[PDB]
């Protein structure tokens, strides 16, 4: 909850700098994921996402079952930068 | 399988360091980027 | 391919027709390309 009140107050405050986090739990395996804004002004958001996805990072796309697979932007831009 | 998580950890701290070097530290190690459509995005978060 | 369909669609909705947008209740409103395009040509 206190992490919620914190990072959300940075979410309302809003540079383009990405906030760092470190979380320690015995259940959790150490990882290194970064979470940029998801596709929905919009042309700006898309722009950040392309820049980040371009470089050879391991990109994690998600898709909701209801959506057509072709239709979803997530898998689609992952196809755009990784054929 | 303790040696297995670790190489990763040793690498993750290093990614952190290249990340923090400086201005010209254009250079870095990859990581996972997470992208999702709005239904998708709620799903992802 | 998917952009040829969007060209012809845009072409259609730009001009003053009474546009009928539909939206499934699962998808979030801001991600539905129907309502997104409906606000794109009609603020």
Q: Are the C-beta atoms of residues A19 and A32 closer than 8 Å to each other?
A: no
- Give residues with Cβ within 8 angstroms of C6, minimum separation 6: none
C29: number of Cβ within 10 Å: 13
Nearest-angstrom CA–CA distance, B10 and A39: 33
- Give residues with Cβ within 8 angstroms of A22, minimum separation 6: none
Give the residue before each break in chain A, using a C-to-N cut-off of over 2.5 angstroms; say none if it is continuous. Answer: 14, 40
**C30 contacts A40? CB cut-off 8 A:** yes
Q: Are the C-beta atoms of residues B43 and C33 closer than 8 Å to each other?
A: no
B41 is in an annotated binding site: yes
Tokens of B29: 């190690």
Nearest-angstrom CA–CA distance, A72 and C23: 15
**C26 contacts A64? CB cut-off 8 A:** yes
Please provide the size of chain B in residues. Answer: 45
Largest Cα span, chain A: 41
In DSSP notation, A48-59 reads: HHHHHHHSS-EE
Q: Are the C-beta atoms of residues C14 and C42 closer than 8 Å to each other?
A: no
Crossing angle for the helix pair C2-14 and C33-41, nearest 10 degrees? Answer: 40
- For residue C3, CA distances in Å to A47, A76, B20, B40, C10 come to 18, 13, 40, 21, 10
Residues 4-23 of B with CB under 8 A from A: 5, 8-9, 12, 15
A35 is in an annotated binding site: yes
Query: Which helix (H) or strand (E) segment is C12 a member of?
Result: helix C2-14
Phi-psi region of A16 (alpha: psi -120 to 50; beta: other; left: phi over 0): left
**B43 contacts A61? CB cut-off 8 A:** no
Short-list A76, A71, A26, A25, CA closest to A53: A76
Q: What is the resolution of the experimental data for this entry, in Å?
A: 18.8
Q: Are the C-beta atoms of residues A6 and B8 closer than 8 Å to each other?
A: no
Tokens of B4: 């297995």
């Amino acid at each position: 909850s206190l992490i919620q009140k914190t990072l959300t107050e940075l979410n309302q405050s809003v540079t383009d700098d990405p906030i760092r986090l470190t979380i320690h739990s015995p259940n959790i395996p150490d990882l290194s994921l970064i979470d940029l804004p998801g596709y929905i002004l919009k042309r700006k958001i898309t722009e950040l996402c392309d820049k980040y996805i371009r470089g050879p990072n391991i990109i994690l796309a998600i898709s909701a079952a209801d959506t057509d697979l072709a239709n979803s932007t997530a898998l689609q831009a992952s196809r755009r930068v990784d054929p | 399988d303790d040696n297995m998580m670790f190489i990763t950890k040793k690498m993750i701290e290093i990614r952190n360091l290249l990340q923090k070097v400086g201005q010209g530290s254009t250079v870095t190690l990859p990581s996972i980027v997470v992208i999702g459509s709005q239904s998708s995005g709620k799903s992802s978060v």
